[PDB]
């Protein structure tokens, strides 16, 4: 007979609920990317992909 420990049942149920809630993480990430897009652009093009070192002749 199958007599799983209630510890295991709680762990599995919480793992499934965490799986369910992780699905909305990308949703909020997309919402915060659509919003504050200028901030994302500054972050992506300030630290990552740093500007080239050069100045105009004038």
């Amino acid at each position: 007979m199958y007599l799983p420990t209630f510890y295991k049942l709680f762990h599995e149920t919480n793992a499934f609920r965490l799986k369910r809630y992780v699905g909305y993480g990308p949703l909020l990430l997309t919402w915060s990317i659509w919003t504050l897009y200028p901030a994302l652009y500054n972050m992506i093009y300030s630290d990552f992909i740093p500007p080239e070192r050069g100045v105009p002749k004038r």
Partner: protein, 327 residues
């Protein structure tokens, strides 16, 4: 997802490493009595191996700073070690498990006397600090030896295990407190517990336990492996018992008297199959009577009873005396 059959379990818990889960007959959670576990662990730590050798050398310091210290403080307070060990002040003051067990099983006096003994001292200490209990109270405190406190402690712990701790099944749980604080909000109970991951089922066989050899060895002679039949063994045993009595004043005898070894040997002979008439018949009768009395649970005589109350309404709440023919 199932915790069993997870990739780690599949790779590790396999017959090759002898890490496979074994399913047997169902058994209760908390299968091991704590008192027995501590007895066996203490025997292994003190009377065996390098740890035993080290701890034997520390007997003087431990006796001075862990036993006589507590005893001196308790005697100053008019108490004994029982008052601090049978029921911890934590349990006595605020503990719902202890409260429920005591209500369901214990007679009120068993804890009322414990509380009143401390009330004696703390009605004076709080009023005026530095209170030293006078000699007359200290005498009744000193009368009881540790040999009865240990019996009470073992009885209580074994009862609690066999009746309550043996009928409990812990489960995965969230924060007990319904507090809005996020730190308390997301407390997770069930993981990081060895018992939670050691066995995923109530049918699993137990993989860690004390061997029968160790359990039987822990019930031998605490002082050491001697032979009370031979004179050489008895001499060493008596020497060790005498030094023990010196180290622990109120453990087995009053701090000014000496232990009666002949009575102890008579008790050992009567208890075990070994027998002989080397002891006086009076000694045997006294030992048997003492053994019977020590194992006798007190009972109520049903005598010297107070009067029960049958209250009645006062006179002013009752009709007047006169009563005439109604018509």
């Amino acid at each position: 997802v199932r915790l069993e059959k997870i990739l780690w379990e599949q790779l590790v818990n396999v017959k090759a490493f002898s890490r496979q889960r074994v399913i047997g007959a169902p058994s209760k959670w908390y299968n091991e009595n704590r008192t027995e576990w501590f007895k066996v662990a203490q025997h292994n730590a003190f009377n065996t191996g390098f740890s035993g050798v080290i701890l034997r050398a520390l007997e003087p310091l431990l006796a001075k700073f862990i036993y006589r210290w507590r005893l001196d403080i308790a005697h100053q307070r008019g108490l004994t070690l029982e008052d601090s060990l049978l029921f911890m002040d934590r349990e006595l003051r605020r503990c719902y498990f202890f409260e429920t067990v005591a209500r369901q099983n214990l007679h009120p006096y068993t804890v009322l006397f414990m509380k009143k003994r401390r009330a004696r001292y703390y009605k004076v200490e709080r009023g005026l600090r530095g209170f030293y209990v006078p000699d007359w109270v200290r005498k009744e405190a000193e009368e009881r030896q540790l040999s009865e406190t240990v019996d009470n402690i073992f009885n209580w712990e074994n009862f609690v295990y066999r009746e309550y701790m043996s009928d409990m099944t812990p489960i995965g749980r969230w924060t007990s407190l319904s507090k809005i604080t996020p730190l308390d909000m997301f407390q997770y109970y069930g993981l990081f517990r060895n018992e939670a991951w050691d066995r995923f089922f109530y049918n699993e066989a137990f993989y860690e336990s004390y061997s029968e050899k160790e359990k039987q060895e822990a019930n031998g002679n605490p002082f050491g492996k001697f032979n009370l039949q031979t004179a050489d063994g008895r001499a060493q045993f008596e020497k060790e018992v005498n030094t023990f009595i010196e180290r622990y004043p109120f453990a087995v005898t009053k701090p000014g008297q000496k232990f009666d070894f002949t009575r102890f040997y008579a008790l050992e002979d009567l208890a075990n199959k070994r027998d002989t008439s080397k002891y006086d018949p009076a000694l045997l009768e006294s030992v048997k009577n003492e053994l019977k009395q020590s194992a006798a649970l007190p009972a109520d005589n049903g005598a010297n009873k107070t009067k029960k109350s049958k209250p009645i309404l006062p006179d002013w709440l009752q009709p007047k005396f006169g009563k005439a023919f109604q018509a």
